[PDB]
RNA sequence: AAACUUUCAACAACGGAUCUCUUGGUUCUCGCAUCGAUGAAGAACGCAGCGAAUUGCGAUAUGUAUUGUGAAUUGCAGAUUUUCGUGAAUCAUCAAAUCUUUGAACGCACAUUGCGCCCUCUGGUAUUCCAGGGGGCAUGCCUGUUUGAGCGUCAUU
């Protein structure tokens, strides 16, 4: 006995234990390799001749 | 008389009838019961040495694995010797996988390849910033879970 005072009228949902994820067992199974490895982010170098103009003269590949 | 018009012939056009064909249909019978949040149906964009479509498949992209078959594929090109072999093939089979973006579509959006937050790791002086890799975050309901709320309500110091 003695209760909770309160000031605010308005009674919120009192914030409690958001617990975390703990499950029983991964979804996924077995953790995808890279999607966008190194190799398959660039694929072919360019060819029209003028690439090969801004290769060599501006410095870009 | 010629030209012309007409009729009729052979040959030639035009045109695609007829005939004959037929990997299509068609109805009838018989057998079976098997989609999907373990992401279905559908879509989008892709992917072939040379493909536009079709057919197949998903950045493992006209396939990978497995099994069988036992030498193809074939338009060209091309391999490779694997041809007394754990092995050819646009083969069959198919139980292992991959399965872009979507889609019931599920982080929140969606005339946008937009905008987040969380966990973890790797870069950059980094718990907080950025970036990269991974794994997540839908709603309802159900069973439990812990955390709570109500002088709803009981019993205690």
Redesign the pocket.
Same mark, same amino acid.
Do not use: E
């Given at each position: *006995?003695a209760? *909770?005072v309160?000031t605010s009228a308005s009674?919120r949902l009192?914030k !409690?234990?958001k617990?975390?994820?703990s499950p029983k067992y991964? !979804? *996924?199974a077995?953790?995808?390799?890279?999607?966008?490895?190194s190799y398959?982010v660039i694929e072919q170098p360019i060819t029209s001749e003028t690439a090969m103009k801004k290769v060599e003269d501006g410095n870009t590949l």
């Open positions: *006995k209760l *909770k309160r009674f009192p !409690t234990l617990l975390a994820r991964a !979804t *996924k077995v953790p995808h390799y890279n999607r966008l490895d398959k």
